[PDB]
Automatic annotation (TrEMBL):
Main location class: cytoplasm
PUM-HD domain span: 1-345
Gene Ontology BP terms: cell differentiation; male meiotic nuclear division; negative regulation of MAPK cascade; post-transcriptional regulation of gene expression; regulation of translation; spermatogenesis
Compartment(s): Cytoplasm
Pumilio repeat spans: 21-57, 58-93, 94-129, 130-165, 166-204, 205-240, 241-276, 283-320
Alphabetically ordered keywords of this record: Cytoplasm, Developmental protein, Differentiation, Repeat, RNA-binding
Protein name per Swiss-Prot or TrEMBL: PUM-HD domain-containing protein
RNA sequence: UGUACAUA
């Protein structure tokens, strides 16, 4: 009987099994639930460098079969860890040619991510050179975008310029990505980690179709990232557009969170623009702020106003709202809405 | 009273 069946049979009868006993059995061990667990704990607990190197020729030899196995991918990942550094380069050579494929696969993509987490920049670049061939499809992929996000988080900004130039490959790409459940994560990481040199054309593209992206289920998270990570002029352009169209932005499901984000990240003079738009006369109608507390989404925006502004800015909101407090008591949740405001009408 | 990602 092969060593694995023997081992799975009576685990405790084999308590002196070592990695150098595995030899040819590596591939079957690594694809086995029990066997892969054995290798893993051996690789982590052993303080013998030569035991650890023993199975490595087999890992390399079977790399293609292992990287996308439910149990083998962990064995390959062990050799991308710190302290196995002496192996990173030849492990990378064993998987390099199929990186374009591995990036899309649910198990192999975890190997690519661990490698990007650990290896030195020259090897990170070698892996990115393969990603380049499939980058656009990769960014919209449930698995592919995790490798792209990891690249952006771990590689020097200058070596992911090809990812930014993909976001800019054609007019509608930034829009296409920002409204993708996976592409939007890529745009966010770019806003977090790229140089302002690199993010400015990207943010520019986002501004051109701002209204659409801001009210999208995924784009609203991209605009929020622009608010937190773009420039002062970006925040200014956004607040200004938000204030001129305050009621339409606040009464929609996704764009309402964008106003909340302006209130949380804005300087005092941006907050003032939003308070002023909300307390504006409009002779022939209730002030905007009052209409906003009657609304399923906008009522959270008004609450965020009251909590994020100065007492001086709150004064105007209190004076504008207070007449209308009884009428607002009627509509559904209208009670509970001013409940959480009774601390400012005390 | 209101929004988003992959393993045993
Ligand atoms: Cl354009």
């Amino acid at each position: 009987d092969d060593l694995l069946t023997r081992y799975r049979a009576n685990p405790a009868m084999m308590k002196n099994l070592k990695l150098s006993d595995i030899r040819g059995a590596l591939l079957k061990f690594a694809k086995d639930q029990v066997g892969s667990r054995f290798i893993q704990q051996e690789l982590a607990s052993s303080k013998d460098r030569f035991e650890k190197d023993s199975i490595f020729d087999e890992v390399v030899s079977n790399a293609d079969e292992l990287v996308d196995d439910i149990f083998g991918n962990y064995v390959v990942q062990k050799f991308f860890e710190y302290g196995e550094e002496r192996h990173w380069a030849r492990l990378v050579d064993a998987i390099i040619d199929r990186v374009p494929e591995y990036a899309f696969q649910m198990y192999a993509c975890r190997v690519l991510q661990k490698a990007l987490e650990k290896i030195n920049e020259p090897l990170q670049i070698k892996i990115l050179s393969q990603i380049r061939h499939v980058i656009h499809r990769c960014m919209k992929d449930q698995n592919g975008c995790r490798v792209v996000q990891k690249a952006i988080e771990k590689v020097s900004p200058q070596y992911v310029q090809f990812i930014v130039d993909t976001l800019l490959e054609s007019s509608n790409t930034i829009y296409e990505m920002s409204v993708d459940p996976y592409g939007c994560r890529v745009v966010q990481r770019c806003l977090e980690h790229c140089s302002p040199s690199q993010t400015k054309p990207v943010i520019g593209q986002i501004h051109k179709r701002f209204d659409e992206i801001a009210n999208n289920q995924y784009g609203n998270y991209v605009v929020q990232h622009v608010i937190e990570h773009g420039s002062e002029e970006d925040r200014m352009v956004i607040v200004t557009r938000v204030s001129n169209n305050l009621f339409e932005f606040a009464t929609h499901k996704y764009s309402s969170n964008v106003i909340e984000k302006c209130l949380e990240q804005g300087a005092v003079y941006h907050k003032s623009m939003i308070v002023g738009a909300a307390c504006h006369h409009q002779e022939g109608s209730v002030p905007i702020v009052v209409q906003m507390m009657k609304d399923q989404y906008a009522n959270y925006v008004v609450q965020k106003m009251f909590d994020q502004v100065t007492s001086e800015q709150r004064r105007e909101l209190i004076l504008t709202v207070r007449p209308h407090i009884p009428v607002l008591r009627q509509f559904p949740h209208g009670k509970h809405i001013l409940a959480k405001l009774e601390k400012y009408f005390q």
